[PDB]
Symmetry: C3
């Protein structure tokens, strides 16, 4: 049995090529990234937008059908994790700097400028579209992949790999053929690029925060390299439930502080308004394409919606693998519902607090927009409240933990996929994957410079385009696998044997 | 016998309110206004959010596996015929809200508009009226009635609100201070809700008698006489015990309501009404979750006063009526599945309300459009008769409207006094006559005080007081949601199969 | 064993219509216009309300416990392959409506707008097209087909529309005057709904021939020739009934439709079509109840003309096609679950329609936006050919569209004639050849008289006559809902248990 180097060599060489290209040819690299972004958006925004909603419909249908009763493993099998631990490690493994970066910038921006098909200065629209971007589509994508891997690995006992879940469509040989290796390579590439995007955004935010805190006058690239090296040493020392709990506690502390000291009643007013507007406008936002607003929503979608849909598909491999790991013995209905609704509620509360505070300030006359730097909005908001100077440090500690709870899980899963789904993989390969993620993030940030944000968005969309089709195909693979279950095999066989009525009619 | 520990606090608060209202009608009004402002500003979000959470919760309970549990033993058959059951359900749960706001509400929303929408929009008017009168209120009633029914029949506990919280607080908690507090809150909510209904009924009857020329001056003594008659009835009803007064008056209510609705339908713009019907339902389900999200931050944060006048007042009113309506619903729903109940309570009254508002609001809106407006001086109690006198043969339908105004009240305020006696006698099905009479007189008193104070308005005071009185019971209803979930999850049929999971969880480690 | 009592009433109505249309082309037009106005004004609410009630009803029936029943002997299996089954359902369910309104409808709504919305809105245009062509119509078909299938296979009753009403009127009623009336209404609706399609198809073929410049100028003789050809086919195709011509022609229909769709998709704005697709479904599902609640008094009360032209006409058209399409759907759905037939009928045709309207309406709208408008004179019968001639290699596609029109009509006309034969022969599967030929000739004659009358437009006359003829059958479908619920509830599997619950209720003391 040959070792799985056919999935290691291509990914390494591709990422090294990307690194050298981004270093030595910054202008050419940026031009190529922009051109690829334009092509991908123009030709596959429809695919992203359509299947974003098809995922949510598919997941609800699966949990409301006969398949919901199944359990992940042998019949009447019991779980191994407590419910509270299960959710605490669900939310903290599939989240990063997304909430901290776009907690304030997103609803405030949509309030100020508006969205296609709607006029500016509409709090309901701002909050509804934020909830759209952060509540049910993103976690439906994770639920589909996690459910597929959990079904493939526990009920059927296959190896813990993405290619395994495709066995019904392609067969065991196909799982071990070129197609399975291609799927694994695509998964690894998507993981690396998604995590690089997250690392870059988080580093930018930490740099802006340190600049605001007056520790540093101007954020230097050397500071970013130092931060990444510190993270490298930290995780290397590490190589988790404790860190997940710490993340939840720190996030709760910061949210509670802002809620108590900010406009409490306005936040609590925005809660029901946010949820109601979200479900009023759910399919009007899901049906938004480049042909809306007389064909003027292309740029907005490429900047906001398609970026998010590609971003959350980049993280689907390693988040889905983790969720499959931590969901042994749970029913399908319980997996799907925990995953889709607990993180959705957390995100709702987070965005309500921070977006509501920002919008209330913008209404009162005080402004935290400033120059419009998306990386300094959080710290501007905090410095607009008493005790912000001490909560900045808690925000920085949280930021750090949000990527260390995920990068830990990205590297572990990437090691797993490179060893035929072994529970533990080579430490050296894990270190190499961590270094690769760091290197990709750093080169993207440096190459982008002024346009670092846009460069990250373009690259993640390009890298995540291939895995959209993998996730689409995995829907059919999961359906076929669930249909062909031991419970219903005999019944469907009886119907198939009763298929002689067609022959009788032809007679 | 009688508790004597829930009665005394309740009577003390009622008498304090009465003396405050009569002795100092300016201080009372000022306090009511201040408390209303504070309550709205600090708990409108609670009212608005949980109004919708109730509907979601009850729909999920009906749709889930728990909707098969019968509200009796497993081999149980309903004791009431479906038509009689639903007739009593509607007659107990709807007082004078369809008569008072049948014409006023859609007409007001057409003329003035609604936050976040342009005026003179018939679809919006009808949709928001249906929002206020269809699903959200009967969802509250279904939750409370289901909790009490499950507590009393399937588990056999005492017929009280406290007994439904045994899952959360246990028997020692249901007999301690918390049980007494819940019973006192339930009694107070019932008294204040019924008093608000009594005040609105008295106002409407006075206006009607003015219109019909039976009495020239609607002075205070006329209102006292109206309340005295309205109390003598509804006290003889649950006292003489000469027969099935409750069922006979329920049937009379339904018959008179049908008669008046049919009259207006035939003599009014029939085709316009029938056009409104599908339009009303479509625009409702179109804007159902956009109205559920309307709050004090909507319309660029200027919708507070409108919500205080319309939505929060309604949500408090229906919450305050929840205790005794829920107890009655539990009473007449033995041996009915947890889904037949949750779908005969949600859907039948919602359809009746839809038809009622379609007919009356459509007639009013069509008259407004055609120039024969009936707004007059804007008195909410002078709309219906103003409408009725605008149709041929309507001069003799004022009397039927009054008879109907009365019957609606008598029927529900006889369901309320019976249940209050039951609560005050540790869950005795057949309450004491004297306790029933005392609660009826207390309700009448409170209604009279609320009406007399602030005579210039006489309507804002009712809304302020009912919101303030019903604020505490919102949390009781939410706790009822959790208690009901726990009690359904801990059924014997589910216990016998789920115990193995807990037993084997430790072994599997 | 011909009926001779259902045939004669239908024959005299058809002959009266033909004579009136031909010999008096002014009186017929005036009467049609007057009847259309009256019917719309007094029953638009009925059409609009029950359109959505049908969708809700069929969804509930598929979701409820009745979904598990099989439409055959217990533990029976389907007799037709799923792909062939669905191909036949789509090919018989619809004829020349996607070829006629594929381009005209979305383009018209994009240009002029719809009531309550501003013009030049792509989302609105697509959403309302989808509304007219996706869920409501196939819901009507599902209801009627399910009723007939359950009456015939599950209960072994006769294959008639009167038989499905046995639960409500009893066997003596099924052979009584009411059964005869229902059968006559079914035949009349079938004839007058198929004549509408024949007229539209002939008009479009004439326009296409004019566009191709095969004929110097169209004349009534060309229309008569086209109608005669389309009658010879569909009368020469039902004669044999042994060579399996219907399945082969259905497959040919699907193949040619796919070919034309693929050509337009590849050569037209592919990316814009693909952009519209998810946008279409989203906007449908957003404004699904906003459109369901659109009636004659929406948008300042000027939606009457638009509704009568578009939505009520569509509703009436599909209701008129319901008898024969439902009987055919029942015919080819033996031994399938109720849920599997209701999903197969509702969803696959809805998806095919969505894709069709995307590909064609999207191309038209994109051309409108670019300035290459295909509107021309505005005639609805040549928008498609203008569109095709606006694309490279669109000259052969003219001929392909013509053949597709022909096959479209033939596949449904054959089934209509066969079902009329079964109706006229007491539900015999194999009808007499002469009855089939006579009914085909009657359909052709009605189409011709409708087309000749009102020669200036010839389309408004078709719409008026279709609405008038399909009005009576709306109530037959509404009654079919109740009949179906009664027949499903009283099933053998449930009859053995609900008796216990009924007996226990009576002794509830
Ligand atoms: C004025 C207001 C009017 C409108 C009100 C509408 C709002 C809700 C009203 C209340 C409805 C409660 C329904 C709950 C289920 C009850 C039945 C049950 O136990 O079986 C369910 C079933 C359990 O399986 P089962 O045991 O096989 O069920 C059958 C039983 O065996 C038992 O079988 P049985 O033989 O005893 O038969 C019982 C019978 C009882 O059924 C009924 O009577 C329920 C009727 C519900 C439909 C609407 C109300 C109709 C009222 C009929 C009576 C009219 C009276 C007058 C009132 C109206 C006046 C105008 O049938 C059912 O069991 C009902 C099945 C429900 C199927 C789905 C219904 C939705 C249809 C949607 C059609 C439209 C499609 C396009 C949508 C486009 C969207 C953009 O579970 C499900 O399939 C789901 C149930 C829940 C469905 C509704 C959920 C809400 C709708 C979506 C809301 C939007 C948000 C969605 C996402 C969430 C986040 C936002
Ligand atoms: C989280 C809040 C912020 C929003 C975040 C995004 C999510 C938005 C949606 C939030 C609403 C969730 C509604 C509840 C979900 C279901 C929860 C659940 O577990 O409930 C039961 C799910 O039950 C259901 O059937 C769900 C029904 C949901 C109905 C929709 C909500 C009500 C809508 C009311 C308004 C209607 C009118 C509006 C029309 C426009 C579980 O039953 P079970 O399947 O475990 O039982 C076993 C049995 O075998 C089942 O047959
Ligand atoms: C251009 C547009 C093209 C696309 C148009 C199609 C859009 C697709 C969604 C339309 C909604 C109706 C689909 C068919 C109904 C359906 O899904 O059927 C199920 C039921 O579907 C529903 O209940 C969905 C209805 C949603 C209604 C939402 C609005 C609510 C209105 C107030 C109530 C019943 O089958 P089941 O698979 O549930 O089997 C039973 C199961 O085991 C559960 O017991
Ligand atoms: C824009 C306007 C919108 C208007 C919308 C109006 C919607 C109306 C939808 C009505 C749907 C009713 O569909 C419903 O189907 C279920 C299927 O089990 C039937 O269900 C019924 O079956 C039998 C009694 O007959 C019982 O065993 C069962 O408890 C009962 O619920 C109901 O008799 C029928 O009423
Ligand atoms: C404007 C017209 C009305 C539009 C309404 C849009 C509504 C969109 C959002 C749906 C959210 C569904 O959430 C799921 O519900 C399932 C039950 O259905 C649960 O099983 C599941 O757990 C839970 O996540
Ligand atoms: C505008 C604001 C709208 C807010 C909408 C929020 C909607 C919340 C809906 C909660 C529904 C709870 O349902 C129960 O859940 C239990 C736990 O899963 C089940 O055990 C039980 O069976 C079931 O009845
Ligand atoms: Na994390
Ligand atoms: Na009453
Ligand atoms: Na056809």
């Amino acid at each position: 049995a040959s070792l799985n180097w056919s999935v290691i060599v291509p990914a390494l060489v591709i990422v090294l090529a990307t690194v050298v290209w981004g270093i030595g040819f910054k202008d050419s690299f940026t031009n190529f990234a922009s051109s690829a972004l334009s092509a991908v958006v123009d030709n596959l925004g429809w695919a992203f937008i359509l299947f974003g909603t098809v995922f949510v419909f598919f997941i609800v249908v699966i949990a409301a059908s006969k398949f919901g009763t199944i359990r992940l493993g042998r019949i009447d099998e019991a779980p191994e994790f407590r419910t509270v631990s299960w959710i605490s490690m669900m939310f903290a493994a599939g989240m990063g700097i997304g909430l901290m970066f776009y907690g304030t910038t997103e609803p405030l921006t949509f309030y100020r400028n508006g969205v296609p098909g709607h006029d500016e200065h509409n709090v309901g629209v701002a909050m509804s579209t934020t909830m759209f971007h952060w509540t049910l589509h993103p976690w439906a994508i994770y639920a589909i992949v996690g459910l597929a891997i959990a079904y493939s690995t526990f009920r059927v006992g296959r190896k813990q790999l993405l290619s395994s879940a495709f066995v019904p469509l392609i067969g065991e040989k196909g799982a071990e053929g070129w197609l399975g290796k291609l799927i694994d390579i695509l998964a690894i590439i998507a993981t690396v690029f998604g995590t690089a995007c997250s690392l870059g955004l988080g580093a930018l935010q930490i740099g802006a925060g340190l600049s605001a805190a007056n520790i540093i006058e101007d954020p230097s690239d050397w500071t970013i390299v130092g931060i990444v090296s510190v993270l490298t040493l930290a995780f290397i020392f590490s190589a988790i439930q404790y860190l997940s709990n710490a993340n939840m506690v720190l996030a709760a502390l910061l949210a509670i502080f802002v809620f108590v000291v900010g406009p409490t009643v306005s936040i609590l007013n925005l809660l029901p308004g946010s949820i109601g507007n979200y479900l009023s406008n759910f399919f009007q936002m899901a049906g938004r394409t480049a042909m809306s607003a007389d064909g003027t929503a292309g740029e907005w979608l490429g900047s906001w919606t398609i970026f998010y849909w590609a971003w959350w598909i980049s993280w689907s491999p390693f988040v889905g693998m983790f969720l499959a790991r931590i969901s042994r013995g749970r029913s399908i209905r319980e997996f799907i519902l925990g995953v889709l609704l607990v993180p959705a509620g957390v995100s709702t509360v987070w965005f309500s607090i921070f977006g509501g505070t920002a919008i209330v300030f913008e209404q009162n006359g005080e402004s935290i927009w400033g120059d419009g730097a998306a990386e300094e909005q959080l710290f501007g908001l905090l410095h607009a409240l008493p005790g912000g100077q001490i909560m900045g440090i808690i925000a920085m500690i949280l930021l750090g933990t949000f990527f260390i709870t995920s990068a830990d899980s990205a590297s572990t899963v990437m090691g797993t996929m490179s060893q035929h789904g072994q529970l533990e993989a080579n430490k050296w390969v894990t270190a190499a994957w961590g270094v690769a993620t760091a290197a990709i993030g750093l080169t993207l940030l440096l190459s982008g410079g002024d346009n670092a944000l846009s460069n990250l968005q373009n690259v993640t969309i390009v890298a995540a385009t291939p895995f959209l089709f993998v996730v689409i195909g995995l829907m059919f693979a999961l359906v076929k696998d669930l249909s062909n279950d031991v419970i219903y095999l005999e019944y469907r066989e009886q119907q198939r044997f009763n298929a002689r009525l067609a022959r009788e009619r032809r007679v």
